[PDB]
From a paper:
In type I and III systems, pre-crRNA is processed by the Cas6 endonuclease, whereas type II systems utilize an alternative method involving host RNase III. Cas6 proteins typically consist of two tandem RRM (RNA-recognition motif)-like folds {also known as RAMP (repeat-associated mysterious protein) domains } with a diagnostic glycine-rich loop near the C-terminus. In the present paper, we report the crystal structure and accompanying biochemical data for Cas6 from the crenarchaeon Sulfolobus solfataricus. The crystal structure of S. solfataricus Cas6 has revealed a dimeric organization that may be relevant for its in vivo function as a stand-alone crRNA-processing endonuclease.
Although native SsoCas6 crystallized readily, reductive methylation of the surface lysine residues was required to produce well-diffracting crystals. A selenomethionine derivative of the methylated protein was used to solve the structure with a SAD dataset collected to 2.8 Å (1 Å=0.1 nm) resolution. Residues 43–50 and 90–93 are disordered in each of the four monomers in the crystallographic asymmetric unit. The monomer consists of eleven β-strands and eight helices arranged as two tandem RAMP folds linked by a single helix, consistent with the canonical Cas6 fold. The N-terminal RAMP domain of SsoCas6 deviates from the standard motif in that the second RAMP helix (α2) that normally precedes β4 is missing and replaced by a loop with an extended conformation. In the C-terminal RAMP domain, there are three additional helices located on the helical face of the domain as well as a β-hairpin that connects two strands of the central β-sheet. Analysis with the PDBePISA server indicates that the four SsoCas6 monomers in the asymmetric unit assemble into two identical dimers (complexation significance score of 1), consistent with gel-filtration data that also suggested a dimer. The dimer interface was formed between the C-terminal domains of both proteins with an average buried surface area of 1349 Å2. The three non-conserved helices of the C-terminal domain are positioned at the interface and may be responsible for causing dimerization in a Cas6 protein that is typically monomeric. In fact, there were no histidine residues located around the putative active site.
Numbering used by the authors:
A (entry chain A): 1 to 39, 52 to 89, 95 to 222, 229 to 282
B (entry chain B): 2 to 39, 52 to 64, 73 to 89, 94 to 283
The structure:
């Protein structure tokens, strides 16, 4: 039976530390060297006071001994330990805050609770969605030279199209560009936007920079069948993140349902 | 066909209580044949460069725009809302063909669209026309966060009416879908607004929810940009979206050098 794991870590530096860029490198180092988990993967930036530490670009961030940093790792389809770990960035006490295991089928069931609820998507970390996902695939060649970049104001259609793609990979089915496109186009046509607070952000992936979006958007899809699909897909993205560079912590979303 | 864009100075000779929308004042004049013999746009009245109880002497401004010659006078006009001194601040006469020529000056410029008055764009303009019947019952309302595609789609429609050609839903749809796919959004400050549009058949107040603010963007495909500039340029005279004849959907178009 295929599953999604979402582990919440507490990460406490035992000495004053300078976090790497991106700050997800700390836990990535651990995982790579086989020290944290044996290895559709998401490794968050380290967070503090409900803000992720990502570099847009000033000086590097100092964290004092004892600060409670948090992290999330998420992946599909593995036993997990904690304790004091040594790293090139310093020594860290890593304990587990939470463990969520969701069966892909149980996602469909939670959708039903929210059929009459509005949808709030929050971009908790800068999110990088490519606009061309809503280009009709038959025109890919024609516009091959066009560099649209990442959307700094993504439409509901683009968001859910990205979610549908993540969902397909999650359930192990090949994503189909045409279904994604059609789904997003129709969603842009029919969605109702209730409110939003969006803004551009420029982030560091010498330096290589990218421009995406952060903030939140609240909306509804007033077609039962289309809403049911969107909720399912969004729910999956809420575990694995969305858009480019999720494995490094970008595209972190939090999904909220407003009664 | 030509486009006329007249800027009026509108000075109430007595303290006045403006109707809702405030464009009703000049609309009354035009309808009764008093301001012009008669693709039309009548702005809301503006004060201190922003679109209520208005004191005697306040310098309100208005803009009226329409397509085809000039037979326009000035002076004191009587209205159910009071007496007003209306003079002409400016007249722009632009040939529809000269629009195509100004497009070329801006091929390398970014595009800033500002919604100066609440703008009411229906999202369903980007619904594939073949699905209109299927989603007949779905009420999407007006977009409170319109995408570049929706904006330029609406512009294309206005342009068609301007040059007297029937708007084609399918061309609008395709043009907006492709524009959403390829546009680059540089910056923005948008927000929802819920406003009173006017009365209805029965006299009940009607509300609507739309957008105001600005959005800056580019279309990095030469051929598509050239089309979009032309259509946008036309919208910058005639406004955009629903209820332009009543002053909604007023846009100002700015080209940012790079």
């Amino acid at each position: 039976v295929p599953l999604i794991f979402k582990i919440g870590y507490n990460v406490i530096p035992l000495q004053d530390v300078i976090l790497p860029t991106p700050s997800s490198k700390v836990l990535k180092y651990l995982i790579q060297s086989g020290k944290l988990l044996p290895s559709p993967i998401f490794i968050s930036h380290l967070g503090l006071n409900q803000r992720r530490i990502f570099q847009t670009n000033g000086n590097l961030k100092t964290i004092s001994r004892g600060s409670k940093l948090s992290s999330t790792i998420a992946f599909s389809t593995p036993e997990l330990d904690e304790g004091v770990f040594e790293t090139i960035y310093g020594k860290f006490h890593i304990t587990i805050e939470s463990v969520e295991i969701v069966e892909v089928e149980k996602l469909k069931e939670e959708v039903e609770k929210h059929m009459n609820d509005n949808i709030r998507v929050r971009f908790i970390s800068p999110t990088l969605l490519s606009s061309k996902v809503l280009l009709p695939p038959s025109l890919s060649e024609r516009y091959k030279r066009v560099n649209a970049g990442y959307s700094t104001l993504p439409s509901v259609g683009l968001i859910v199209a990205y979610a549908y793609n993540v969902y397909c990979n999650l359930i192990g089915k090949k994503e189909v560009e045409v279904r994604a496109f059609k789904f997003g186009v129709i969603s842009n046509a029919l969605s109702r936007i209730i409110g939003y607070d969006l803004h551009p952000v420029t982030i560091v992936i010498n330096l290589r920079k990218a421009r995406g979006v952060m903030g939140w958007i609240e909306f509804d899809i007033p077609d039962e069948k289309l809403k049911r699909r969107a909720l399912r897909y969004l729910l999956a993205s809420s575990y694995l993140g969305i858009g480019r560079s999720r494995g490094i912590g970008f595209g972190e979303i939090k999904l909220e349902f407003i009664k």
